[PDB]
Design a protein around this ligand. Structure first.
Ligand SMILES: [Zn+2]
Length: 472
């Protein structure tokens, strides 16, 4: 049968199933309703930055249609919805004056979710730094972000936390560091060669450190000021794609492990163990900031659960570790990506070139965190795949590859949970086709099709798969 034995009975009692969006990717009303610009507004409006020179001005217009979309997710038997609050919709300048119309939108959305029996899981940040803060403070390069983010978080806790009980601070800080400050392909477009300036060998590490310090500060504020009354939780969302040694050679096994450490360990060792991975300390040396004992103690234990965004897997080949002039976070890993093993690709690709369909990567990631980090509470906060541009409506709706994707990846998650992994929930990226960053509207990740001419929603086969799987 098309569920492949999956149902709510196949997962733990009270296991949470949801779908996911982010503010800039779905809301629209980017320069309306009092919202100030984010670094993504400025970036997307610059010709050449995004596929087709597209932007999130309108996106899916969830801002106007949110009750339609909530009705849809309830009809598909989901328990929860992960979405983000746009910082510049609340504070158009990132600090100071509150935009009451923005606050009203999130109140309305949260209230409707609760009315319809859908639990809100709310990200405070999803790439969309207020442009004013980038210009005034230099964004995540500035340690002052901890104070600025804490004050924003405090407002959100005060304003929404009597209703919202499941928070996340950041989303994929690794990708912000990598693409914003190593490769320079996401805002602020910084890198060694870049027009905007930068240094690919130092800035990614500064940025990651500031995300960690800012997360810890916001959680300390929650715990000391809001937790007694509100009794909720705050976590963080980290991407983790699996790395598998190309062979059982000492050097290939070491490479796959170095990659895991530079990818997920970069954040998880601080959050769980209060220090950066030893290999990062060894290889990155003085370019890796040092936590003071006090900071390390603030960061350690500061996530109530770990959100993992899990999409794909790669084979890794090793090499003798060399002394080399630093060039970039990416080059610091001293690993070699390889396409195939024993003449076979690791998996077929979805629309996105980086997205290899490798269901066993889900098991790899979850088992790895279980075994290495004392089995922390994990929530799979994103998992999904994309279709290309230019298909017909019917072609989008018959998304048999995505049905197969969810059945296979969820079977692998189930395998890890049945082996004892403390996974509390799973969220599909995305509820809706939406604005996919550099790919704009050319990448379709939704279980629900959105016609970007008419803005109409139509559930795809994968949406009905979830509805069947999740029936109560
Ligand atoms: Zn509208």
């Amino acid at each position: 049968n098309w569920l492949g034995g999956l149902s709510r009975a196949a997962f733990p009692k009270r296991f949470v199933f949801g779908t996911v969006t982010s503010a800039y990717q779905v809301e629209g009303m980017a320069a309306s309703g009092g919202r100030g610009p984010s670094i993504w507004d400025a970036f997307a409006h610059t010709p050449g930055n995004v596929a087709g020179n597209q932007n999130g001005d309108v996106a899916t217009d969830q801002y106007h249609r949110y009750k339609e979309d909530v009705n849809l997710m309830k009809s598909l038997n989901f328990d929860a919805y992960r979405f983000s609050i746009s910082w510049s919709r609340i504070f158009p300048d990132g600090e100071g004056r509150v935009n009451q119309e923005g606050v009203a939108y999130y109140n309305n959305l949260i209230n409707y979710l609760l009315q319809k029996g859908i639990t809100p899981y709310v990200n405070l940040y999803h790439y969309d730094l207020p442009l004013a803060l980038e210009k005034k403070y230099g964004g995540w390069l500035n340690a002052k972000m901890a104070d600025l983010f804490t004050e924003y978080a405090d407002f959100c806790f005060k304003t929404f936390g009597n209703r919202v009980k499941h928070w996340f601070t950041f989303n994929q800080p690794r990708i912000v560091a990598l693409l914003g400050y190593d490769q320079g392909t996401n805002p602020p477009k910084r890198c060694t060669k870049c027009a905007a300036g930068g240094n690919s060998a130092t800035e990614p590490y500064i940025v990651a450190h500031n995300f960690l310090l800012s997360h810890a500060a916001a959680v300390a504020r929650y715990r000391t000021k809001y937790q007694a009354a509100q009794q909720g939780k705050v976590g963080i969302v980290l991407d983790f794609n699996w790395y598998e040694a190309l062979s059982n050679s000492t050097e290939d096994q070491a490479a796959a492990q170095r990659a895991r450490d530079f990818h997920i360990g970069w954040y998880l060792d601080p959050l769980i163990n209060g220090h950066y991975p030893q290999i990062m300390q060894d290889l990155v040396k003085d370019r890796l900031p040092k936590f003071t004992p006090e900071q390390a103690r603030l960061v350690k234990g500061s996530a109530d659960y770990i959100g993992i965004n899990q999409y794909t897997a790669s084979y890794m080949k090793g090499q003798q570790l060399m002394q080399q002039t630093p060039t970039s976070y990416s080059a610091d890993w001293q690993v070699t990506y390889v396409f195939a093993k024993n003449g076979k690709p690791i998996g077929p690709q979805a629309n996105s070139n980086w997205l290899y369909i490798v269901p066993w990567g889900m098991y790899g990631c979850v088992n790895y965190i279980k075994q290495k980090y004392g089995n922390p509470t994990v929530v799979i906060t994103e998992n999904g795949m994309d279709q290309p541009a230019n298909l017909s409506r019917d072609q989008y709706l018959r998304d048999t590859t995505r049905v197969h994707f969810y059945r296979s990846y969820l079977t692998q998650l189930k395998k890890a949970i049945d082996e004892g992994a403390n996974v509390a929930g799973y969220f599909a990226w995305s509820l809706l086709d939406n604005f996919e960053w550099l790919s704009g509207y050319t990448s379709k990740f939704g279980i629900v099709y959105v016609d970007f001419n008419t803005l109409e929603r139509h559930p795809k086969a994968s949406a009905y798969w979830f509805r069947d799987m999740l029936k109560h």
